[PDB]
Structures are given as C-alpha cells and as structure tokens.
Design a binder for this molecule. Structure first.
Ligand SMILES: CCn1c2ccc(C[NH2+]C)cc2c2ccc(Br)cc21
Ligand SMILES: [Zn+2]
Length: 196
C-alpha cells in the first residue's frame, strides 16, 4: 500500500508554512514555493510551521512520514541507508533506521507500522507560544538523497498529517525534500531548470 498525499485542510484549516531563508551557498535549509520542495543539509534543523484557522481538540497530534515520489518506488519503505542506520548517532529516542527525526521534543513518538513497516514520527499538537502566530516543529533528515543503498538519488516527499487522538485524519499537507550538501545552489539550479 501507499499513504495518501492529497492536500486536505479539513475542519481546522490545517496547512504548513516555511521560512524565507534564501539561496546563499551557506544556507542549511531553504524552501522553494515554486517547486514545493525543501532543500536541506544532512541532520540540520528544518523548521516547519503549522497553521490552523481554528483550535483543534486536546489530544490532536502531528505526524511526519516520508514516501518515494516516483510511482515505481512508492511501495518501498523510505529508510536510512546501510551506513547511516549503523553509525550510532541516535538521540536516545529515534530508532536508528528512521530518516525523519523531531529535534528537541521529549514527547515525540516513533512508529514502526506493524502492517506497512513504514516509519513515522508524531508529536502532540501544541498552540503557539504567547506572541507567536503559529507553531513550529524542527525536523532533521538523517540521510542524503544520494546515499547508496538507501534513497539512492530517488526523490522523496514528506507527508504531514494532523490526527485526532485515535490517529484518524484531520488534515494533510506535503512537500518534496532533497537532502544535499549545498541546498542554496541546488534550489537555484532546480528553479532555473523549472523556468527553462
Ligand atoms: C497547529 C498549531 N496551532 C496554531 C497555529 C496557528 C494559529 C493561529 N495564530 C494566529 C493557532 C494555532 C493553534 C491553536 C491551538 C492549538 Br492546540 C494548536 C494551534
Ligand atoms: Zn545515508
């Protein structure tokens, strides 16, 4: 099977937001609206904003999962490559096989689906800090898109789902991800390719 990637704002008007980080060679994470694609360095902080029009119930959660973008690979579980799953860089909570981690949230839970074997990481949905207009989750991607025997240059999507306390769908958004050495350069290149 294959998880849905259909954008769905749902009853609470759920959607993502991204910072405007630019494309300098020194940037570590940058988002392209034209490509709906996040470019980031290995294991660096990726801020993702969560926006709603109305307050979801207590117990609402936010889940992140990666799938391959190309149809011929969508049934393959996205996981870390044979090197990175053994490099002993765990944070104490994320299983070493998981591509996506949440940084700095002790309530993050990591799921290995008993049926699909797919990995995901889920956190409680929290209201914005006083003075802020949205909530931000900090994600890390723990393999390069190019890693041999893992993603192996295949593009991936991250699916973010807003869930009730049972895991039922309340909202869904998604974005493509490239984990690479030079996100600013690669964003500029792919945006130019798109224009051309
Ligand atoms: C999904 C995170 N998020 C928000 C994001 C934006 C806004 C609107 N601010 C102007 C309100 C909320 C909000 C309110 C309650 C809870 Br629980 C989570 C919330
Ligand atoms: Zn790797």
């Amino acid at each position: 099977s294959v998880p849905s990637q259909k954008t769905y704002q749902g009853s609470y008007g759920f959607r993502l937001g991204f910072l405007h980080s630019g494309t300098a060679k020194s940037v570590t994470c940058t988002y392209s609206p034209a490509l709906n694609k996040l470019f980031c360095q290995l294991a660096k902080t990726c801020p993702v904003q969560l926006w709603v029009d109305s307050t979801p119930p207590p117990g609402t959660r936010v889940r992140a999962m990666a799938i391959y973008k190309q149809s011929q690979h969508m049934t393959e579980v996205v996981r870390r490559c044979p090197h990175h799953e053994r490099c002993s860089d765990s944070d104490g909570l994320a299983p070493p096989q998981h591509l996506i981690r949440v940084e700095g949230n002790l309530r993050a839970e990591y799921l290995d689906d008993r049926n699909t074997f797919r990995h995901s990481v889920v956190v409680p949905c929290e209201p914005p800090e006083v003075g802020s207009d949205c909530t931000t989750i900090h994600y890390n991607y723990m393999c390069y898109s190019s890693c041999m025997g893992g993603m192996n240059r295949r593009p991936i999507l991250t699916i973010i789902t807003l869930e009730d306390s049972s895991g039922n769908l309340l909202g869904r958004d998604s974005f493509e991800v490239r984990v690479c050495a030079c996100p600013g350069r690669d964003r500029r290149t792919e945006e130019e390719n798109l224009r051309k």
